[PDB]
């Protein structure tokens, strides 16, 4: 009954204050690339099948505007590719999909809403930002109907190989919404993530987990929230690694076309009796020229503990860290969304 | 005069009863992936050029809904990419194309019609199923006009390198149709298939051939057919390998929305005086929720000779065989087709 | 305010008279592939933002019709991927873009207009033809407004890594147009081109430069031009290489549907006190069956100095040279353009 072509183009100039060079000294990194959202194009549709029943699909491909290449592991529909049925009693979808972490926790974070890439937590450790390979393959997802503001669901992501536990995943989450208040909680687990090309997580072991909970509130021109997440690697005789992230964010619309957002995140990682931590704060001014086009300017600052180095997530996990405990990232950019409904 | 965007999304849950693990024991394989048809999207068009003359093109890309990646060798338009001219005296098309085996024999098989992937013959040995890299590169194809139900044509697929015979192919076939009766025969040959990146067959030698003939009949709610194919590798001092496939299939529409199909295939492979064989039978129930959406359920069973192992084709030739002479594949899935004509 | 889907399909049969085989003897190369233009599909749009201000984008992907694969380095939007703002005072665009060489010199060449691939200069040495990886990544481009027929602009292409000069590029050019007269000049420089995956030029060092100038004139059914370009590799203790290209071209419309073009190019390359040269002449007959479809036939002939070998550019830099000082390339082909404006 409807097939929509859509996309988002986001390009900006970014300065990063200190990025290690091969000579070991720190220099600034200048780049052109996605500032807030990862660029993408997609096809989505829904067919009315009568009785509240609908067939739905989404095919969504992320790419780097700087070089035209696929990212998120490099496949065609590297963000989402799924088909399913929606009814009054819930939705079941099959394919490559984001999991409950993304459905129920990301909307409570700056990186998952107005902030995007550079507001991600260190190394995107809790998989909240999707400018990065965070979708899961071979996924069956159930999403409940809305029960008076309560929604819940989960995923199982098959290994697609004769070893059932070798690169699979699952998750569960729930949200509660009421007149501007949003609460969410989620739990996700992977076994042998990235261990092969058939399973749930693309290459790049043991057990990896993300869980968290938070809440946000919106009224008028003001919105804000709090969010806790933990990412954990265990069952490796390597020592367990765990990272906790504590974020507060607020966004205020000065005018209907000018939003300013501020976010702060404290991250604390522990392994084998030792601990490192990062403090990150960012501010973003975003100006809408139309419903489809906005220009933005932002600056993010991160300081690590003295036994560690700073690195603001820029969409590329291979980016070398700062040589110091400090890094600044400042971006000016342009974002354009397009949309065709095929009447 | 018309450009159409289209696609097919097919996702299902498959159980395969016995697939070898690295430890050598057989375990079940559970997977999410294409059940019947390979998922694909495409662009096709035809321009009226006057006098019965038309310009036509098809750009068609297959992909795995489970992980969003291209398959069929991994290129962009990995199923078909061609442009050509159609007239009252026949059609000439240029590009990456299926050959006469696919045009004239596949419609007589369950795997090429209602059955799809898991109804393919062992290892897709006769290239009848297109959930697999069976298109040929660099192809010039002629298709005749309809001469009172007779159609014929063929292909030559260039090596695109200074060695004219190093990775090239050609084929020829013909069909006869009359009021529900269909007859087809075809012959295809490749030399040094997959020996380079420029030629007709993608990587993954000597002379490889497929030929076959069959017939089918449709009237009312009932359709069925018989088909013989042989695949042959020779001119290798390695010993010639040949495989013969004998298939019978029948499909019956219980209701206008519920089809049940049954297929049986006997396959016999011979090499260096020794012989192996497979018996395969499958049943599929397919229920149309609309013209665009259907849900299906099927079960396939294969038994090999005692000097061999069972393996039901699942779209992935790297899938390990069963550790026994038996394998069962059962699938429940969802298929959705979309279409936009751009009025 | 508008999003357009578009594409060009170009397929032809090419004979090349002498291409080296591994045995060292020269044989003819027969191929199916792009004759004139590289096949491509794309999405482009522009939104009216009021006051002469517009948001624009182009996403353009080149591919080989012969095998369905991406070319131009193999990424998704491997020809152009950019977003930007256009105003009365000029245009700024960000992403993967052609540089000033392509904007201001290519329109004065046969290879950049009616001639295409096989009219390129030896090894596409001056990057004038786009059936080849000539776009630059991470590019900021400014294009001025038209000042009474004068247009100018330039590019800077970031390295996107902490070494600012390690795989970056920039360019500048200008044109002057008046009633069929066109003049252009351009200059482009890259440092450490292809040295990494983050920078301006895709893999496949020191300083590489292209510059040139030319003019063309069109009136009625007749058009022609002259163009000089130089490509230079220096700062390598390897010896500097430089190549100068001198081209004359003319195209005449016999009828409104039949164009004949002739081009001649002399190329002279010098390195370490030695010199090689090539003479190339080509003729193309192009017949429009409609505004969207044309069939063409052409022949190109190249003779090299006796200390070198002939090689007519065919879109593939890995193609081996002729074993002699001579090579002929003859092509017959079909080109079809499509277009949908989404009203
Ligand atoms: O739809 C499927 C979602 O269900 C999520 C529950 O996860 C499956 C149970 O796995 C937990 C231990 O295997
Ligand atoms: O259109 C071309 C189709 O023609 C098919 C015939 O194949 C060419 C002959 O090759 C057989 C031995 O080379
Ligand atoms: O818009 C940017 C285009 O400007 C082109 C000028 O190039 C920058 C200067 O670089 C020359 C030496 O670095
Ligand atoms: Na209309
Ligand atoms: Na459309």
Q: Helix tally of chain A?
A: 1
Order of helical and strand elements of chain A? EEEEEEHEEEEEEEEEEE
Assigned CATH class of chain A: Mainly Beta
- Computed CA radius of gyration of chain A, to the nearest angstrom: 20 Å
- What's the main sheet of chain A like? 16 strands, antiparallel, barrel
Any idea what the CATH superfamily of chain A is called?
Porin
- Label the structural class of chain A: mainly beta
Instruction: Say what oligomer this is.
Output: homotrimer
Task: Tell me which ligands are bound.
Answer: (hydroxyethyloxy)tri(ethyloxy)octane, sodium ion
Question: What is the CATH architecture term of chain A?
Answer: Beta Barrel
CATH topology of chain A: the name is Porin
Strand content of chain A is: over 45%
Biggest interface: A-B, 39 and 41 residues
Portion of residues within helices of chain A: under 10%
Overall number of structural domains of chain A: 1
How would the global form of chain A be characterised? globular
Order of strands, main sheet of chain A, comes to 1-3-4-5-6-7-8-9-10-11-12-13-14-15-16-17
C-alpha termini separation of chain A = 10 Å
How many strand units of chain A? 17
Protein name (chains A, B, C): Outer membrane porin
Domain Porin (chains A, B, C): 1-306
Subcellular location (chains A, B, C): Cell outer membrane
Subunit structure (chains A, B, C): Homotrimer.
